[PDB]
Design a protein around this ligand. Structure first.
Ligand SMILES: Nc1ncnc2c1ncn2[C@@H]1O[C@H](COP(=O)(O)OP(=O)(O)O)[C@@H](O)[C@H]1O
Ligand SMILES: Nc1ncnc2c1ncn2[C@@H]1O[C@H](COP(=O)(O)OP(=O)(O)O)[C@@H](O)[C@H]1O
Ligand SMILES: [Mg+2]
Ligand SMILES: [Mg+2]
Lengths: 189, 524, 120, 532
């Protein structure tokens, strides 16, 4: 693992992409290295630290949701339209059909936990939309503010049972949602 | 349209490709033919990343060369193999392989199947190993004079030869300071515990191996003493500040006296950890992770010098030197884990950097080479030569045998197996003698490099090298003359020579068994 | 049975089962439970209190057979209550001949089916 | 006409195209057959090169876009899986007899007749091989295995080195004796771990009387040699016990906070003492080990290895008598560790290799094991040596399990060819023509042999045919039937007395697989290729 010397570490950091160029870290590794940074530019690194701290506190101020809240047709108008300025929702319309509702329900809890920044709401099709066809068993109709932003209706759109944990992140984010910490379009396979 | 194989697949077959393979090896043997001998010539290599490598050894030349011909790729892999296994004889093995293929091509043309050539090559390899073991002489390990002579023989053909009388000593010291006895058996000699570090600028002979460890760190706090006479060093792996943990805690506060109580709990935890460290009375604490402000304050109140994050290899060599032991949980920091024996700890300033020395320690098992020179490339070449000398010293301490140098042993084994082949009969005798005169290139290479005429000199050498136990007679490449290597006094470990011969013959077999090439397709 | 949303086997559970010298098999599709019950005679169990020996199938032998290094199979042979169900296993060099053999066997079975349907 | 939106090739055109594809694959693989044929050198698109001789590797690395050749590649892969030897021979047989059958069809003989002839000829050939061409490897002991390994390695990069290799090869197989149904010995090959190293010559390859896992001690300070090893194989990571995905702690008063944090390590710590309370001396685990646990192990004077591969740990536990543990939980509700589940090894040493270090577990107490380390000039030579060694191990296993071998060097092929030509007079029908063709097809293997050695193949195959004719038509000359061609002087010599034997499994499986591949590729009457 870390049984590698200075030359080996330089070789690895050069081979990975190019270099970390002492400008692209979070509050963790720029804080832990803490000694490779040369001392003639303390003001620049401290200004960067203060701006990143401001960014972190701003992000934590708007991270207040944490988990999905499920609603009925009564308040559906308010959480589909009056959810807030600069916030978009998920609106997973689900039933007790086992496969796709079950998988998506288990995955959305994890996504909401790891994204406390975006609203997750799930509703049952019977009492949210009058006489929904119910053949298109999944339904995540993403609303940007109150308008259409994306739509996933068919199990073929997701791909059926073969759904992993985090490719849903990319599927939601491709429409313009919060950025991803993951690469590759269809999460490899 | 209609295809069987891929569109991009190309195929080559027949003697054509065989010739190509041989030629490829010769080309690889042609780049670094002038780098062999005490009169070698430096070569400059331009890295794709902007660096420059100014070197002599063959491996450092080939590792910077990319070849799309797969036979040359095999030759480069052979060079890396010889560099890693023994650390010496790269140019010798590459030249030997090149000339063995070059002489096997002649038999390939004369409608001879490669299999008989391979069999003769293997027989020649076995016989040359036998007769190379025959002419060997023992070496006295306890004798330091002969050790210095062997390292001089290994270093006379590099750029630091002018400082050989220094450099050899350095290598010897390091190799005789890492020598360790493991649990019961398993004597070891590892270069992970022999670090060479380059500090540009200064004087080359100012370089020396320190009786201890040097790292490029600084004291955590200004008030902590930068000069410790007899340190008691404790080595830490974990961190000395407060960390969240692993599970999700999410402490809930409803009272007025829980927030400040939480913060005071963090402070008291740091205080308790530092008091656990302090109670056993250390003097220097080395940690691989960060140090909290409270941590260094509490350590300082007990007059302890704290060195912040240190790479794990440096901590391992520090532990091996001082005799200490790394502990992650401070509450289990035992008395036996405290490092006593470090003769002096000094935070010196070199150029515009702070360097910490734990030198003067008793009977260390790890060393650091203060290698001071003039430039980064000069120091890189110096440390490469030091690594070669270290590898040769380890080879001769693990093998008490020696063999004459300057192409004397090669000519001796060539003549021995030539006289062996003169009695047998068959079709395999011709490749046998082909290998016999194939081992002859390196003396010829030395004579060519020194600037003398190879024809008459090598003819005289071969003629005189036939009678009256003259197997130690070789060429002096400084004066380009024929000398008896006993008076000249250049000897090489038997391991290096036998490994060179084995690797050359095996590379010849590998590139001679091949007759078809299919190029261009998906990985799998 | 193959249970998504909840690991039907845990490391602790498998450890205990192996300690009691038992054979455990997982990832059984929901569509095959009727076939298994009709073949060997077991009855599905969805509650621990209902798990008894009165609804536990029996067989003379259970084996894990290796096909000369070309896969692995589970064979249950000698069921004490032989149901109206048999199974056919096919062998072949390449996939194409195996598929064609399957189609030919199916055609023969359909011919016998037609002969059973109307006797002429 | 047809509205298919595709390309249709019907009649003699598609038959000729399929035969061309099969012949192309056969000619690709044919140059590397026999103790004289050389090996091929495949370079990929990226540039990585592999030096290979066995047909299976060549055909898997190659990419083919014709079904009539994909079937041949699949046949080679199947022969590798089922047997392990004769991967090139089966492809050569299949393609050449397919060419012969297409030639027969060209005279307007129905392909059903030639398929029936091939089926009957294959059945008769297998029967003749079983009856009048096998010798029991019972009177010959410890030498039939050596000869089989030698003749399996002759064509490889370690050919004349076989005397050094074959010996140790059988030793490896003799270290994996097993009992399954109390009276049937079993040889679970692939349980011998093959290690690569690119240091010394080929004579320095090591046969270790004990498993040699390719890992390193967890921490440098831990001892690297154990005089008497009490191995404790584990299958769980020794890291701080994070609670669970579901269980999550919630603190109301800070006075109860710090304590639980101690527990977050102590649990793990506790486990370690239990493992070390029984005198465990070496610890092997598939999961990771954190720094604190490494500190416990180094302070206890016992070496610990992390991230050991599951198959390696399984083999170590089987060989040393240790019991692999997924978790510490007995039939009661308390964690415990018992001395009854520690394997015993006479030595465990981290031995240095060309540049790195690998761990040798020597003289495991429970049952003898073995491992092989291959030293070579570079990576390509070592990997080719590993492939050849795998082929040799497979051959020795086949010989030991099925105690019967047949003469090599084209003896069985010539005998079958002459018998099948003497056959086909039983039925007297037109289908007999097919059988006759099959006979001639079984002459391909000897021919190409002498083709690779630049010898006069026609004279050699004529001499083999004459000798086998004399053997078959004269009962007292039966000893002539064990004869095959030889390369050192281009002479037909008795390979039964010379020491060239191949397990009958290779020949039988190759014949059956080849004839069924030819049948399944010969039924084609037209090809309909649809547009992507
Ligand atoms: N003064 C000398 N006179 C003649 N030959 C020498 C002398 N010093 C070294 N040699 C020979 O030159 C060879 C050293 O060449 P070197 O550059 O070390 O090759 P490599 O790069 O392959 O290690 C040795 O084989 C030795 O026999
Ligand atoms: N020493 C030998 N003398 C004569 N024939 C041999 C010898 N060794 C192997 N052969 C023959 O060469 C044929 C090809 O075997 P080989 O190509 O090495 O196996 P594979 O087909 O698995 O690559 C075998 O049928 C065998 O009879
Ligand atoms: Mg040298
Ligand atoms: Mg073979």
């Amino acid at each position: 693992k870390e049984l590698e010397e200075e030359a080996e570490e330089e070789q690895r950091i050069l081979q990975q992409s190019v270099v970390k160029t002492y400008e692209d870290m979070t509050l963790e590794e720029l804080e832990d290295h803490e000694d490779e940074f040369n001392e003639e530019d303390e003001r620049a690194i401290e200004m960067y630290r203060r701006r990143r701290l401001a960014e972190w506190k701003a992000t934590k101020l708007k991270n207040k949701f944490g988990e999905v809240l499920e609603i009925s047709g009564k308040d559906y108008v308010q959480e589909v339209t009056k959810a807030g300025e600069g916030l978009w929702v998920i609106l997973h319309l689900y039933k007790q059909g086992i496969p796709l509702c079950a998988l998506i329900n288990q995955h959305l809890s994890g996504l909401a936990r790891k994204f406390p920044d975006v609203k997750f709401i799930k509703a049952i099709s019977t009492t949210c939309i009058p006489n929904y066809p119910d053949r298109n068993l999944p339904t995540i109709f993403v609303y940007l503010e109150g308008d259409i932003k994306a739509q996933f209706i068919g199990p073929l759109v997701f791909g059926g049972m073969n759904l992993t944990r985090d490719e849903l992140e990319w599927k939601l984010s491709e429409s313009g949602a919060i950025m991803t910490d993951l690469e590759e379009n269809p999460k490899k396979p | 349209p209609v295809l069987v194989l891929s569109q991009n697949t190309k195929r080559e077959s027949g003697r054509k490709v065989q010739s190509g393979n041989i030629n490829a090896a010769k080309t690889i043997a042609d780049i670094i033919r002038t780098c062999l001998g005490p009169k070698s010539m430096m070569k400059m290599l331009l890295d794709p990343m902007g660096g420059i490598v100014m070197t002599n050894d063959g491996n450092a030349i080939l590792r910077e060369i990319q070849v799309q011909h797969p036979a040359a790729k095999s030759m480069i892999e052979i060079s890396r193999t010889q560099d890693e296994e023994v650390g010496d004889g790269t140019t010798s093995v590459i030249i030997l392989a090149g000339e063995m293929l070059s002489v096997a091509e002649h038999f390939l043309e004369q409608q001879m199947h490669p299999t008989v050539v391979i069999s003769a090559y293997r027989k020649a390899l076995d016989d040359m190993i036998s007769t190379l073991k025959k002419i060997s002489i023992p070496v006295d390990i306890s004798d330091s004079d002969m050790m210095l002579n062997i390292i001089n023989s290994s270093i006379t053909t590099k750029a630091i030869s002018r400082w050989s009388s220094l450099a050899c000593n350095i290598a010897l010291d390091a190799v005789k300071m890492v020598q360790f006895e493991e649990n019961g058996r398993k004597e070891i000699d590892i270069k992970k515990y022999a670090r060479v570090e380059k500090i540009p600028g200064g004087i080359i002979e100012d370089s020396c191996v320190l009786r201890g460890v040097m790292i490029n760190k600084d004291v955590t706090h200004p008030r902590m003493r930068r000069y410790i006479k007899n340190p008691r060093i404790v080595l830490l792996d974990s961190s000395l500040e407060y960390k969240k943990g692993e599970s999700q805690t999410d402490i809930e506060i409803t009272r007025e006296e829980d927030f400040t109580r939480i913060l005071q709990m963090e402070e008291e935890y740091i205080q308790q950890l530092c008091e656990d460290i302090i109670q056993l009375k250390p003097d220097v604490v080395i940690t691989e992770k960060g140090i909290s402000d409270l941590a260094q304050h509490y350590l300082m109140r007990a007059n302890i010098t704290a060195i912040r994050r240190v790479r794990k290899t440096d901590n391992n060599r520090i532990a091996r030197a001082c005799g200490a032991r790394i502990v992650s949980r401070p509450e289990e920091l035992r008395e036996d884990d405290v490092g006593t024996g470090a003769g002096l700890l000094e935070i010196k300033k070199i150029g515009d950097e702070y360097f910490t020395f734990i030198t003067d320690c008793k009977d260390p098992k790890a060393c650091t080479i203060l290698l001071r020179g003039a430039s980064k490339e000069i120091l890189s070449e110096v440390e490469r030569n030091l690594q070669d000398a270290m590898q040769v010293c380890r080879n001769v301490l693990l093998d008490p045998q020696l063999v004459p140098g300057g192409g004397a042993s090669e000519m001796a084994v060539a003549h021995a197996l030539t006289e062996k082949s003169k009695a047998m009969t068959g079709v395999e005798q011709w490749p046998y003698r082909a290998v016999a005169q194939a081992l002859e290139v390196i003396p010829r290479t030395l004579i060519q490099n020194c600037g003398a005429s190879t024809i008459r000199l090598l003819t005289s050498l071969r003629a005189k090298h036939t009678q009256e136990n003259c197997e130690t007679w070789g060429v002096n490449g400084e004066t380009g003359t024929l000398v008896d290597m006993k008076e000249l006094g250049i000897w090489e470990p038997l391991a290096v020579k036998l490994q060179t011969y084995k690797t050359a013959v095996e590379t010849a077999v590998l590139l001679l068994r091949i007759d078809d090439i299919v190029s261009g397709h998906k990985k799998k | 049975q193959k249970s998504i949303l909840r690991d039907a086997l845990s490391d602790l559970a498998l450890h205990f089962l192996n300690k009691m010298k038992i054979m455990v098999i997982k990832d059984i599709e929901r569509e095959d439970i009727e076939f298994i019950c009709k073949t060997i005679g077991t009855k599905p169990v969805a509650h621990i209190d209902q798990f008894t020996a009165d609804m536990l199938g029996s067989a003379e032998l259970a084996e894990e057979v290796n096909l000369n290094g070309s896969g692995k199979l589970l064979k249950i042979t000698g069921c004490a209550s032989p149901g109206k169900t048999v199974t056919i296993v096919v062998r072949g060099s390449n996939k194409l001949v195996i598929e064609e053999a399957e189609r030919s066997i199916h055609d023969a079975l359909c011919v016998i089916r037609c002969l059973v349907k109307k006797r002429a | 006409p047809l509205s298919v939106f595709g390309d249709r090739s019907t009649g003699e055109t598609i038959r000729s195209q399929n035969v061309m594809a099969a012949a192309s694959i056969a000619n690709i693989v044919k140059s590397s057959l026999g103790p004289v044929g050389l090996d091929k050198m495949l370079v990929d698109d990226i540039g990585d090169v592999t030096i290979t001789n066995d047909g299976a590797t060549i055909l898997k690395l190659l990419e083919v876009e014709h079904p009539a050749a994909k079937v041949l590649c699949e046949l080679a892969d199947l022969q590798d899986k089922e047997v392990g030897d004769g991967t090139t021979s089966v492809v050569i047989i299949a393609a050449e007899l397919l060419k012969n059958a297409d030639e027969l069809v060209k005279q307007k003989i129905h392909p059903t007749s030639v398929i029936s002839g091939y089926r009957l000829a294959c059945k008769e050939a297998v029967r003749y091989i079983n009856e009048n061409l096998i010798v029991n490897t019972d009177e010959l002991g410890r030498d039939c295995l050596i000869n089989a390994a030698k003749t399996s390695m002759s064509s490889k990069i370690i050919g004349i080195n076989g005397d050094f290799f074959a010996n140790m090869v059988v030793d490896a197989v003799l270290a994996i004796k097993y009992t399954d149904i109390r009276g049937q010995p079993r040889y679970p090959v692939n349980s011998v771990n093959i290690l690569k190293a690119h240091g010394r010559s080929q004579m320095e390859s090591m046969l270790i009387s004990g498993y040699a896992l390719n890992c390193v001690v967890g921490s440098q300070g831990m001892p690297k040699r154990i005089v008497n090893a009490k191995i404790a194989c584990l299958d769980f990571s020794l890291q701080k016990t994070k609670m669970k995905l579901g269980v999550q702690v919630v603190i109301t008063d800070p006075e109860k906070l710090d304590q639980i944090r101690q527990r977050e390590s102590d649990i793990t710590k506790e486990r370690i003492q239990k493992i070390l309370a029984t005198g465990a001396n070496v610890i092997l685990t598939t999961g990771g080990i954190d720094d604190m646990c490494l500190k416990y192990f180094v302070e206890a004077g016992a070496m610990a290895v992390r991230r050991v591969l599951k198959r390696d740990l399984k083999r170590i536990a089987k060989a040393s008598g240790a019991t692999i543990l997924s978790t510490l939980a007995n039939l009661e509700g308390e964690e415990t560790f018992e001395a009854a589940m520690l394997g015993q090894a006479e030595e465990v040493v981290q031995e240095r290799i060309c540049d790195d270090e690998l761990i040798l577990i020597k003289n495991t107490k429970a049952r003898t094991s073995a491992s092989i380390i291959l030293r070579g000039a570079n990576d390509f030579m070592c990997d080719e040596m590993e492939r050849s060694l795998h082929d040799a191990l497979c051959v020795v296993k086949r010989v030991l399990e099925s105690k019967s071998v047949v003469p090599g060097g084209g003896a069985v092929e010539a005998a079958l060819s002459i018998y099948l030509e003497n056959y086909a007079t039983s039925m007297g029908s037109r289908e007999q023509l097919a059988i006759a063709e099959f006979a001639r097809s079984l002459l391909v293997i000897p021919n190409t042999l002498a083709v690779n050695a630049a010898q006069d193949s026609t004279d050699l195959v004529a001499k083999l045919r004459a000798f086998h004719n004399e053997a078959q038509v004269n009962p007292e000359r039966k000893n002539l039937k064990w004869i095959g061609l030889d390369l050192s002087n281009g002479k037909p010599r008795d390979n039964k007395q010379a020491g060239v034997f191949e397990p009958t499994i290779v020949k039988v499986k190759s014949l059956k697989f080849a004839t069924e591949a030819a049948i399944t590729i010969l039924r084609i009457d037209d090809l309909i290729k649809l547009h992507p």
